[PDB]
Structure formats: C-alpha cells, structure tokens
Design a protein around this ligand. Structure first.
Ligand SMILES: COc1ccc(CCc2nc3cc(-c4c(C)noc4C)ccc3n2CCN2CCOCC2)cc1
Length: 127
C-alpha cells in the first residue's frame, strides 16, 4: 500500500532547449492551472497512504501531477511540447479512472481540464 518514488524531474542524459511552445506551457498553461482554487490536490503526487487509498497504485501505473510537470518545465526535462501535454492528459485521466462521476475531485479535475483546453487552444506554433 506504500507510495512509489515520485516521477523523475531532472534528466542528466538529455539535451535542453527553450522553445516558444515550452515557454507558453510554463508561463500560461501551468501557471494558470497552478493558481486555480482547485489546484492543491494536483500540486504533488497522490499520497495514497495519507489519503487512505491502498489500491491507488494497483490501479494507476502512470501517476502524474502538476508539481512534477512544473519541475519538469523549470528543469527543461521536456524537449517536445507534446511530452508536457501528454503529462497533463495523464494526470486528468488517472483521476477519472480512480474516482467516480459525481465525486468532488472529478468535478474539480473536469474544471481544470476545461481551463487547460482553453489555454492549449492558443499554444504557439512549432519552430
Ligand atoms: C491526509 O492526507 C492528505 C494528503 C494530501 C492532501 C493534499 C490535498 C488533497 N490531495 C488530494 C488528492 C485527491 C485525489 C486525486 C488527485 N486523485 O484521486 C484522489 C482521491 C483527492 C483529494 C485530495 N486532497 C484533499 C483531501 N481532503 C482535504 C484535505 O484533507 C484530506 C481530505 C491533504 C491531506
């Protein structure tokens, strides 16, 4: 029932670059969701022990959270913008898999995902 180690956030064996899309992903997308009233449950890995979720890591094999995404962006862990977009999508999908329609956390994830999609709509073009 213990938690796994958190996802990696710093990659020493990978080159680094600054693109307009990565700048938007941190400055607009991540920062807009991070400041939202509903952000706390998504700001660090799910602590299944503290929250009394013993089957969480039996069901969710690709955990992801915004604290991880934020550190990945700040650390230039991503080379392609799509790597970051897929991490946001994984985070929302995990919430939907584990929880039920009508659960408060699901409504919160749905509101954050709608906001994510509104901001992704204006992602700049690839170089
Ligand atoms: C006692 O252990 C903790 C552990 C983490 C946190 C951070 C906030 C938090 N993190 C959460 C993750 C989830 C969640 C996600 C995300 N995916 O599935 C589940 C299920 C749901 C709710 C969460 N909440 C608020 C929970 N409430 C209000 C705070 O006291 C506990 C009850 C607070 C307390």
């Amino acid at each position: 029932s213990m938690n796994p180690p958190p996802p990696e956030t710093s990659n020493p064996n990978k080159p680094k670059r600054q693109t307009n899309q990565l700048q938007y992903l941190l400055r607009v997308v991540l920062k807009t969701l991070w400041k939202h009233q509903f952000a706390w449950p998504f700001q660090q890995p799910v602590d299944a022990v503290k929250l009394n979720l013993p089957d969480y890591y039996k069901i969710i094999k690709t955990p992801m959270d915004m604290g991880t995404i934020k550190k990945r962006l700040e650390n230039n862990y991503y080379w392609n913008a799509q790597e970051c977009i897929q991490d946001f999508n994984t985070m929302f999908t995990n919430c939907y898999i584990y929880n039920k329609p009508g659960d408060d956390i699901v409504l919160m994830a749905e509101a954050l995902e709608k906001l994510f999609l509104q901001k992704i709509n204006e992602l700049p073009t690839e170089e």
